[PDB]
Amino acid sequence: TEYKLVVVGAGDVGKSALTIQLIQNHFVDEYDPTIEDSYRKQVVIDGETCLLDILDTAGQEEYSAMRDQYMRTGEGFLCVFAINNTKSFEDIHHYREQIKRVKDSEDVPMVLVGNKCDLPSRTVDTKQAQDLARSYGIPFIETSAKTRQRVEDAFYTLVREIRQYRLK
Amino acid sequence: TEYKLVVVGAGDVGKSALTIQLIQNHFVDEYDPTIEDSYRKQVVIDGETCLLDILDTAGQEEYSAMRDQYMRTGEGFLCVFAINNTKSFEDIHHYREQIKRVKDSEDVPMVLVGNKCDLPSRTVDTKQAQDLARSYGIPFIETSAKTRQRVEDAFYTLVREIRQYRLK
Numbered sequence: 001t002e003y004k005l006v007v008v009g010a011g012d013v014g015k016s017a018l019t020i021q022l023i024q025n026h027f028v029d030e031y032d033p034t035i036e037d038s039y040r041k042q043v044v045i046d047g048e049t050c051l052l053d054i055l056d057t058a059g060q061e062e063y064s065a066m067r068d069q070y071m072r073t074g075e076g077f078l079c080v081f082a083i084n085n086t087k088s089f090e091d092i093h094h095y096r097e098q099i100k101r102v103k104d105s106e107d108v109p110m111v112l113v114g115n116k117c118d119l120p121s122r123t124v125d126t127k128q129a130q131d132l133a134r135s136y137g138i139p140f141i142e143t144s145a146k147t148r149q150r151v152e153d154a155f156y157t158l159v160r161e162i163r164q165y166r167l168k
Numbered sequence: 169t170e171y172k173l174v175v176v177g178a179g180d181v182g183k184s185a186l187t188i189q190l191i192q193n194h195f196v197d198e199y200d201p202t203i204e205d206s207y208r209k210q211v212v213i214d215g216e217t218c219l220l221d222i223l224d225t226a227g228q229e230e231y232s233a234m235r236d237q238y239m240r241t242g243e244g245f246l247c248v249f250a251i252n253n254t255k256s257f258e259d260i261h262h263y264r265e266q267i268k269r270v271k272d273s274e275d276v277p278m279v280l281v282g283n284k285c286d287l288p289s290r291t292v293d294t295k296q297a298q299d300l301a302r303s304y305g306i307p308f309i310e311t312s313a314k315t316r317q318r319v320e321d322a323f324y325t326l327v328r329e330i331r332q333y334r335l336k
């Protein structure tokens with residue numbers, strides 16, 4: 001029943017930073033007497049219980065067996081690039097296309113995120129990213145994990161996209 | 169075709185340390201003109217191409233949707249405890265039992281690893297661990313990522329267990 005969110009994108013774009021900040025602000029301790037220690041942590045976003053996973057394909061993950069499994073399991077995807085890393089923006093399309101193939105679906109809940117919007121060394125313009133999101137039919141949000149701008153907004157937006165998809 | 173190895177165990181036992189050390193010693197750059205950049209890194213152990221994944225269930229992973237997927241995908245498991253952490257040893261049985269349920273199999277290639285054997289603050293005796301491995305019918309090896317003792321031996325042993333299982 002939980003909303004299954006997957007954060008995906010190139011290395012070093014801030015996927016871990018964004019996810020850690022989200023957890024810090026949204027984790028709760030839940031009483032559950034059907035488990036050994038009687039309490040478990042969960043993340044609740046916009047009234048919805050959420051599971052969170054990060055899909056990397058670089059570094060250690062260039063050796064993983066699990067890429068396609070993450071894409072099959074995930075329900076909605078936060079597609080992250082960094083606004084000072086043109087290659088990370090170019091890499092978005094590959095991840096989206098892979099997700100659609102693995103899920104065998106034209107309709108998958110996604111949000112495009114341009115992270116590191118605090119930085120002055122921008123090489124990806126807001127309009128380039130807007131154009132990409134418009135083509136996909138999805139929201140685009142600029143965020144900063146460093147300055148804590150729109151981090152919550154990005155995850156809330158994805159939760160809404162999943163909720164809408166579940167109504168279809 | 170690749171051998172799919174999963175490293176599993178409690179938090180802080182040295183799963184990342186062991187895996188990083190293995191990769192450092194066994195990664196190769198492979199020529200493959202069917203991919204964009206023409207080269208990809210792979211890990212080769214005992215002549216076998218291997219994929220590597222780490223299954224954690226604590227910390228960030230207490231929020232994951234992926235536990236059972238790791239267990240279904242993995243072919244052989246390196247079940248790690250630390251010899252200065254009695255709880256991590258007690259936790260092994262739960263992981264093994266979960267793996268067997270998810271895989272719906274009584275026969276799964278595994279190796280039991282007691283890591284941190286460099287430490288003088290031992291609370292898990294070699295004989296306790298030997299007894300557990302004997303019950304399961306699997307090898308037991310003590311390792312140290314810090315002093316680089318038997319790290320390669322642990323992964324080679326698991327590769328042999330998988331190879332034997334593939335012959336059945």
Ligand SMILES: Nc1nc2c(ncn2[C@@H]2O[C@H](COP(=O)(O)OP(=O)(O)O)[C@@H](O)[C@H]2O)c(=O)[nH]1
Nearest residue numbers: 011012013014015016017115116117144145146
């Ligand atoms: N300036 C800035 N740095 C960030 C931001 N988010 C992450 N970083 C830094 O970018 C690097 C990569 O972040 P990380 O979370 O490890 O990225 P991942 O590899 O995508 O998980 C780290 O040094 C972070 O501190 C951000 O919004 N602004």
Ligand SMILES: Nc1nc2c(ncn2[C@@H]2O[C@H](COP(=O)(O)OP(=O)(O)O)[C@@H](O)[C@H]2O)c(=O)[nH]1
Nearest residue numbers: 179180181182183184185283284285312313314
């Ligand atoms: N003394 C000692 N420390 C180790 C050894 N392996 C890992 N560590 C330390 O134990 C801690 C946890 O290791 P880590 O690889 O992060 O464990 P994981 O959470 O199971 O992936 C870190 O501080 C490591 O440096 C070992 O063989 N000996």
